[PDB]
Subunit: 294 residues, 4 copies
Amino acid sequence: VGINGFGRIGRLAFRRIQNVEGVEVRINDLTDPNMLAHLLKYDTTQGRFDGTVEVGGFEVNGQFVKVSAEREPEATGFFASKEKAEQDVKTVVFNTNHDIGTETVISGASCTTNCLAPMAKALQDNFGVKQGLMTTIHAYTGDQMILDGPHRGGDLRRARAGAANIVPNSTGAAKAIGLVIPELNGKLDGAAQRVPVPTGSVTELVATLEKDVTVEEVNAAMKAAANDSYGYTEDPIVSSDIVGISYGSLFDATQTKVQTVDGNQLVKVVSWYDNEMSYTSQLVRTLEYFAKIA
Amino acid sequence: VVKVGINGFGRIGRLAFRRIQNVEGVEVTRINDLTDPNMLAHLLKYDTTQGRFDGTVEVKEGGFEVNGQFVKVSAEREPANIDWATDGVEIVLEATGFAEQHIHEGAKKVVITAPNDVKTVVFNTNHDILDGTETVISGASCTTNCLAPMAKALQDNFGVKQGLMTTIHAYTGDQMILDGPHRGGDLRRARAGAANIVPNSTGAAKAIGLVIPELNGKLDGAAQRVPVPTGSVTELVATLEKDVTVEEVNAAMKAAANDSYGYTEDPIVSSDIVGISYGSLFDATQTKVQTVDGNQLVKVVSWYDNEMSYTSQLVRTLEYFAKI
Amino acid sequence: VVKVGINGFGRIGRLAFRRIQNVEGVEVTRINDLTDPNMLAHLLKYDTTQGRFDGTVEVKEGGFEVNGQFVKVSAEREPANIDWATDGVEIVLEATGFFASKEKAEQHIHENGAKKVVITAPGGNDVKTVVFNTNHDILDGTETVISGASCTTNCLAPMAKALQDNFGVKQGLMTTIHAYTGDQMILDGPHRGGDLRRARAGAANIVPNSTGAAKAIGLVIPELNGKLDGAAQRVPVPTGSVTELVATLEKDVTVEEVNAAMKAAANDSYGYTEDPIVSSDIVGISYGSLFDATQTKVQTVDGNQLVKVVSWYDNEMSYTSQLVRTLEYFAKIA
Amino acid sequence: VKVGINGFGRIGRLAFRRIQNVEGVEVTRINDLTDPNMLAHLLKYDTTQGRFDGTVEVKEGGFEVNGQFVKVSAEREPANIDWATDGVEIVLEATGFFASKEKAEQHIKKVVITAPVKTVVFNTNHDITETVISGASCTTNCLAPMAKALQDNFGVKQGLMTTIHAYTGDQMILDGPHRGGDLRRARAGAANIVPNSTGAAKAIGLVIPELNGKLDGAAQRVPVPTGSVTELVATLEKDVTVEEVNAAMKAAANDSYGYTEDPIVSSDIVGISYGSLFDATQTKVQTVDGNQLVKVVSWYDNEMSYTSQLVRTLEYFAKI
């Protein structure tokens, strides 16, 4: 395994890989290894590093790992394309559609799609969804400004102080769900509300189903669909409790609503995820499985 | 001029007082609260979310001296003992936990900062129901003032079948500052309010019926308490009787706009609605009309300052009710 | 193996339990708290600042099942009625708040009860105040009730001891940049105890606040009695604090001498570090105090000097770790 | 006095806002490289300093404000900016790139620079014609009227400063590589107490020569988006009481230096016009043996306090 781009996703992917047997990880990033070693050691949201780091590259808990700084050749964000990857791209979400050998380039999807997919999948199999609108109450991220200032991408809301506001933002995750679950292509749209927590998110989905359902039917269905990626809990948890978790998505039975007005129904289903570590865990799970195939 | 009395000088009472300073024919001539005046004067002057007080406040024997003007502050336990008419008070703002014990020698009318036989009024939504006969009326909850004009606008123009509401809300005083035991037993309000996204139940979507009877039973919702000290946004996903576009929805909200229901197309955030005078501010940039097959879901979004939006509305009702 | 009892399973009691799990030769075999076990278990499991519990916790009739091992949880309002010895309990952490004097704490000492008690509240006059690896030498063993001191005096003491022993302190002023605490209002409202600053939204303000930990350092280090005073700026982080001490010494010194002194004075309770860390790095640490060499100053203008010296601590878990150390040690003497 | 602003970041925008509420000071040109739609939005809406007091509409060229047209250009090098076309006499240099004489010379009449050249702090040493001057740092504007008061009344030997500071744009929103290699400013600014060095204490000599070499300090950057406090522990020549120092500061109070005895917090000083607000409630005078340590504390809004001082300096300097 070789990591290009040692930002937040890169450093956590590494951390995650230290506690997985058959993977291990070379790194490439343009910044000072002193800077990177310090940021690997110490982490605000995810706690101190589990081990030692000392700065050719840096050695971690003994083993040397060579860290290069090449301009041109994958978690940099600069090379987010099919052609842009040196030795339609398959969007994969583990334990959802990883069942789709070969390939040049695959995408582990967006952090939000990995939360949405298993829950949305569970609804289509059991009940069949007609349509639905998504809202993710989301932690703030690096593309937001720490204080009100000119955004590089021209976005007037991400220009605002990220940890002092509720900030609406557009997300493609809900619309691009067709690329993992073609059954739901064009059925789901959504938006985000970025809020002052440094990591940890929840995704709410209000949807209309093919057949009538109860609150208990919905919850049971999700408990039945639970696995390593898609968690299940009936504990009244909050965002800090899901920081650092290994589930890509964690369904919360306590927030479920099935509103019946006349014969018609609206179903609300809610799933937690740590936009950092929930995604990174599903990324590594995929990363491992993908090296297994050829 | 409408002389006003405030019973309960908590967050709402102090903000009502503040608000009334910049409203013409309304003046507070008597405050009644049981806490130390020195504590009250300091909290009236200095305010985390709403800024320094626009003026000067000094404690004196009997009351406060605000901008020169003396305002009596008493500390009567039972509302029966308060001699409101001595200070010319023709209406009371009841903002603690009650109530015609204000009505005697005393005031003539009263407004409760809550929801009971008493009429629930959201200004510029259903303040037409007040014939003037009434003795006690209620201004409603803070989220009810946000949702109501937006909801009503959908029911008048398109008719509402049903809808689910989610409010991304500022943290509140009923949440713990740090992880601890909650008096009631709530395992989520037990957690650090300024360090978490905390799911919570709200009955404001249900009790909308009291303000808009047509939507009684049709609306339900919940809240996600988040780490800002004030400011909130209510998202309503709803099914309508007519087919619509996003433009038609937005144009209808613009056509329903007033002092209570604002309209904007600016990509704002929560701090931009802190201290506003609108009860609700419709944000047309967050509108969605999803059409899958022939069926439609309509998403509709409005900002509010759970403190000052409510308080502005509350004062509008207070002045109008007194002037019948 | 030291079998421990907890009376009062609040913030501190739960953290002491958590801390004890990762320490050997110290084990909790009885808990006593009057709140609903469901509420307690939940708050043991889930924790905003200190993270998810390391293991599993299920409620059960009689007590908790923590990762297999059953731990008894009684609800006795009177300490006289807690049969601690039945669960072979030797020493009791008294973290309730309602038995914060000696005679009151001594209600845990009977035939079928405990042998010793450690209170989380101040040791008043006839109750010795112990900071571990600072003045735990004062315990002969005959003692019945001791106090594990305040959270800030556990941070300030090792750093202030190291200065006195090496260089001698004339005087000093302390400033603690402190996490906001439970006694602060979440939003602007009337504070019960009258305090116009604790009245304000704790997580949206820098809030000055007094602290007697600098003044009451004498109870721990009698050398320094009357030499130190200080104050606090409470700020918007849920836990984690940093203490700065500007001081005048008896000897003249350089920046490298003092940092070396702190490194030589370093131990299990007093950490040493030269990494440029921030408050989130010291969350959940076992050091009572963690000296930071990077912030050290020695301003020499004329012959006269001022020495500024700085140390991190987690006002939740650093205190707890010192509390568990003093709790362990005190049981091993009798 | 017609004023031009180069760099429309936090200070540049707030200066614009402040100048609206000042009698004979008018902004008639702004120069910033970023999109006028972006800039007009950030003027209208401001997280910590509230909505703009008026209307702002982007138009062809620059943007209209309360009907009136303000030009907004986008020239990189300070030459090329034809400031005189729009009648401006003085320029507030607020980018941070042209932080020196020579670079700040964009004369082709007066310039006021935002970095640390003659360094002024209004109502402290604005008594000291010129072309390029400095309005100083934000922290320096807090410390100076407080330190000056101790020098004049009691005489300062020595002192150590600690500023508990609101987080700022040069800190990362989340943990990541800082451009200037700082391992602390790299960290999530709004989720940490973040120690950091400041030269405001050392460079006080420039504002008050009497105190040169005598004061040093540092900063603890904390999670509030604006609003700061400066603590100064210091040894004096004379012996003092707590009451004597509090009465000194009250006597030294003016438009720039506030005096309060109210037990306030940082949100209470957001958007104030005072460059520094002395807080008597935090004063200490520790006497151990005969020797004394004196602690003096002053609030300031690193954004608007600094800006308010900047606009006083600017107005005055044009009128000489």
